[PDB]
Amino acid sequence: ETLTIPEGVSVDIKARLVTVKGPRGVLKQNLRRVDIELKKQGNTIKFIVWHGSRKHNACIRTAYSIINNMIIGVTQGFRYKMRLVYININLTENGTVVEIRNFLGERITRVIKCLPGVTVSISSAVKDEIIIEGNSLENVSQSAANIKQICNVRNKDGIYVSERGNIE
RNA sequence: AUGCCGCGGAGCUAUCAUCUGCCGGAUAACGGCUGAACGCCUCUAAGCCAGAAUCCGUGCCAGAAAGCGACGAUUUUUUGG
């Protein structure tokens, strides 16, 4: 299990804390869940184990996957396309606070607080489509899941999720 | 042994009259996120969210008579400090 380091990124190991940096943004993550030694050869990071438990087999893959998520996230983006299917719908707000109105004919102006590092572009290029941008894959995925779960159904038309995109 | 009757201030009293009676966290069931192993997949394996009249708190009552703090003057020309 080897993964080369991209050019321009500075990834370091400090008590299993990764501080992935780039000219367009910085991301951080804690790894107090893996018992695999981390080494650097000056051009590639290596994971080392010595006859551990069987859970370490999944630990290596999880560490490789999250390090790959950080590597793609520091350079590229995580564009999220939210589609609205229906009773009219609208999202008129400013800043990092997103407000949704007229859900199934309701009148409550329920508000949503976005996670740190997430900036919805709120562009109206495509009808009933919302573009969500966030450098942290975990945070943007949690935010998108929260948005979908906020609009729930009781005593049963609906709104579902859509595909994703790419930025940077 | 308040003789009886009507009205009778004050007091007492009446869901027979009037006034007043909050919001923060942690959760159970349960729903999700990144994500492997079991190269797929799945809320879970680590973690992070949401979540009940539940629990703990804000608030309300008492105040350790052997818990504590700050402040005031320290027997007046007999005598004591």
Swiss-Prot record:
UniProt-listed InterPro entries: Ribosomal_uL6-like, Ribosomal_uL6-like_a/b-dom_sf, Ribosomal_uL6_a/b-dom, Ribosomal_uL6_CS2
Location in the cell: Cytoplasm; Nucleus; Nucleus, Nucleolus
Single GO BP term: cytoplasmic translation
Pfam families in the record: Ribosomal_L6 (PF00347)
Keyword Cytoplasm: yes
Keywords: Cytoplasm, Nucleus, Ribonucleoprotein, Ribosomal protein
Gene Ontology cellular-component annotations: cytosol; cytosolic large ribosomal subunit; nucleolus; nucleus
Molecular functions (GO terms): rRNA binding; structural constituent of ribosome
Extra remark beyond the main annotation: There are 2 genes for uL6 in S.pombe.
Family: Belongs to the universal ribosomal protein uL6 family.
Function field: Component of the ribosome, a large ribonucleoprotein complex responsible for the synthesis of proteins in the cell. The small ribosomal subunit (SSU) binds messenger RNAs (mRNAs) and translates the encoded message by selecting cognate aminoacyl-transfer RNA (tRNA) molecules. The large subunit (LSU) contains the ribosomal catalytic site termed the peptidyl transferase center (PTC), which catalyzes the formation of peptide bonds, thereby polymerizing the amino acids delivered by tRNAs into a polypeptide chain.
Subunit structure: Component of the large ribosomal subunit (LSU). Mature yeast ribosomes consist of a small (40S) and a large (60S) subunit. The 40S small subunit contains 1 molecule of ribosomal RNA (18S rRNA) and at least 33 different proteins. The large 60S subunit contains 3 rRNA molecules (25S, 5.8S and 5S rRNA) and at least 46 different proteins.
PANTHER family, per database record: 60S RIBOSOMAL PROTEIN L9, 60S/50S RIBOSOMAL PROTEIN L6/L9
Protein name listed in UniProt: Large ribosomal subunit protein uL6B
Organism listed in the record: Schizosaccharomyces pombe (strain 972 / ATCC 24843) (Fission yeast)
Taxonomic path: Eukaryota, Fungi, Dikarya, Ascomycota, Taphrinomycotina
